[model samples]
Target: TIYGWGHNHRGQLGGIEGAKVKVPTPCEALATLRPVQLIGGEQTLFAVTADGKLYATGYGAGGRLGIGGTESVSTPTLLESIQHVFIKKVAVNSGGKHCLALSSEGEVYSWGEAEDGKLGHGNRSPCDRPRVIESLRGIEVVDVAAGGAHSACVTAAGDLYTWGKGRYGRLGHSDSEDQLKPKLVEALQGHRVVDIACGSGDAQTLCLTDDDTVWSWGDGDYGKLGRGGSDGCKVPMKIDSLTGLGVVKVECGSQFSVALTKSGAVYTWGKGDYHRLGHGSDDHVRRPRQVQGLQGKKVIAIATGSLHCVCCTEDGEVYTWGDNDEGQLGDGTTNAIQRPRLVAALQGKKVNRVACGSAHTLAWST
Candidate 1:
């Protein structure tokens, strides 16, 4: 089952008609789909079923929903354009202008607004339907990410490819220039990258290597790059402060970054306004700092929104903090929280994973 909360002005909550859900509410419309993954974008939500089927709801302007039309949907609707293809993963950002999907065969497909060549189709044209990215035909892509106006993917061999708006060096290509199509991130060629994340509302990117180290590049405002300074880099640079921390996963929000260590500890940095950093303070942190509230909680997974965050612990408990103006924190109140607070509404459920939109959240449970 899936539970959702927060801003639903465009009906991103899947069948719930209200403008917002103040607490975790069941998404009855998608109950039968057996969704395994839930991805949230700008006023949009997507679900990948256990059988590899894809569904979407919420804002659909510019065909961002891949439903072959520019209409916002209030219910979970199947993305029929690529129904025949078995999708393994899907990526979208808070900007939510474009979307990218990876097929089970390791092929990539792009659709929606093609602004600045974000769709990787070699042309700045809008596509209402999914189109195969021919340039990446032979490579076996294992993971993919879609940013505000950029895209990236990791191949089976650990090579990273990035494209689209290159301002602020977001594409990590050593120069600020737009890439009409996917281009290899040469600086990361020798490293074996395992996971990658792109900031939804900002031009920042992060990658995790097999050595348990993290590399960051792009927008450095508020120290979002975790480089101990607010200087942006045009190339990938290791976050020296996180060295030997056994970092396993990295994630980015609009102007902040997070790292999950092997010890199940959570660390955050960058713009801390509204308590998005989960440090009980709104002061911007220049380097990675442990989220003291979750010190011994053993967080198993984490998700970040434009100004909020959520995490699931090993015992199936859910914790939330940061912006709650639209009740994105699922605490049944609109008050912002500076420290991690257990989502009491989900006390009895064993949540498997969670996803965050710009001002909303979703969770999947058994």
Candidate 2:
């Protein structure tokens, strides 16, 4: 079953009628789809079924929904353009206006607003339908991520490629210049990157290498880069604070960051307004700090929205914190939380995965 909550002003909750859902609400409209992955954009939501089919809902301005037209949908709709392709993953920034998908065959496809060449099609042309990223034709993409105005992918050979708006050095190319097509992040060459994440409302990027080290760059306001300073860097820099933490996963919100270590430990930093950092105080942190609330929880996965965050524990329990003005916290109230709290509404549901939009959240439960 799939459950959604929070902002529904634009119908991002998969037909769940309401302006705000303060608790986990079942998306009955998609109950039969058997979705395996759920991803949220600024005002859009996407689901990839177990059989590798893709569906979308919510604001479709600029064709970000990938339905071949600009029409908002309150009900989940299939993206027929690449229905035959076995999609392995889909990525969209909670504050972005575009989308990217990776096929099981290692192919990458992009759609939506083409401004700043975010689609990576070698031109600034709007793609109403999924289009193959020809520039990366031969390289087998292993993972992909989309930001507010840029896109990135990691090749099977551990090569990192980035393109689109490069302001604030978000593309990690050592210069603040827009790239029309995929360009190698030379500084990351030779290092095997296993996972990558890009900030939404803010221009910053984070990646976890095979060595358990994390690297960050781009906008550093409030120390989102985890570098102990609030200054942005044009090139990727190692986050010395997380060097030996054995970080297996990393995610970024508008101006904050989250890291999950092998020992089930979670760390956060950067803008803490609304308690987005999961700390007891709403104070901006300059470097990574352990989320004390999750100390004994043994979290297994983590995700973040523009201001809120959610995670699933090894036992399938879901916990949330941060912004809840629109009920994004799914705790039966619109009150912001300063520390991680178990989403009581989801108790006994055994949720295994979770995703967040700018103001909403999606969860998959067995």
Candidate 3:
């Protein structure tokens, strides 16, 4: 089963809207599918089934849902246009206005906003349906991620490519110039990047290399670069503190960043408003600070939204905190949490996956 909580303004909670659910709400609409993965956009939701089926419901502005038109659906709708292939992964921009889908065959398809050539379609035109990136046809893409106005992807060879609004150096090209086509990040040469992430609300980008080092660049507002200052880096720079932490996973939010160390410790930095850092106060932390609330707990996964945080333990317990204006914490209230709190609704449930959007959340249970 899968559950959701938070902003449902555009029917992102899977079939209703205008009301923000304060507690962990079970998405009965996806019950029959036995969803294995859930993804949220700014005001939208998407789910993928174990049988390789994709379902979406939410604002269809510019056809971000890839269903065929710019019409919104209150219920899960099938993307018949992409039913021909088996999708393995999907990534949406922070604003939830665009999306990138990676098929099992290593092909990437894009939809929605084509402004600033973010869609990498060779033109600034909106895509109402899935359109294959002709330029990346021969490269076998393994992972994909989208920022507020830019996009990135990792190939089987561990090379990174980026395009779109390149301001703030989000493209890692050592400059803030817009790229109309997919361009390789030459600064990351010699290092194989394993994971990539960019905030939905901010332009900062993070990438974890094969050597367990985290490299950051782009808009460093509120010290998101984790270098102890609010300065943007035109090229990838290594985080000095994380030199020996052996990070296994990395994530970015609207103005913050979080990482799960191989030692089971969680660290966060950047804009700490609303206690998003889980440090007991809303203070901007320039460097990575260990989440005291999660100390001694063996957290295996971590995720961040526009202004909230979610984590899962090896034992499958889930905890959330930060902004709750739309019940993003999933703690049964619209009040912001200053510290991490266990989601009582999922206490006994084994969570296999968790994800966050600009202001909503999603989780898969067994």
Tens-place lDDT per residue, model 1, 1-366, is 688999999978888857879899988987777787788888888888877888988899888888888999999899897899999888887556788999999999998888889899898999988899999999999999988889999999999999998889999999999998999999999898998988754578999988878999998889899877799988999998888998888888878989998899999999989999999889999889999999898898999888999999989999999999889999888999999999998988998688888899987676
* lDDT by residue for model 3 (149-180), tens: 88889998889999888788888898888887
Clashing pairs in 1: none
lDDT of 1: 0.88
Question: What lDDT does each candidate get?
Answer: 0.88, 0.89, 0.83
The candidate scoring highest on lDDT is: 2
| C-alpha RMSD of candidate 2 | 1.1
Candidate 3 backbone collisions, by pair? none
TM-score of 2: 0.98
Off by over 4 Å in 3: 16-18
Residue runs of model 2 more than 4 Å from their true location after superposition: none
Task: In angstroms, give how far residue 356 of model 2 lies from its true place.
Answer: 1.2
Candidate with better TM-score, 1 vs 3: 1
Models 1 onward score TM values of: 0.98, 0.98, 0.96
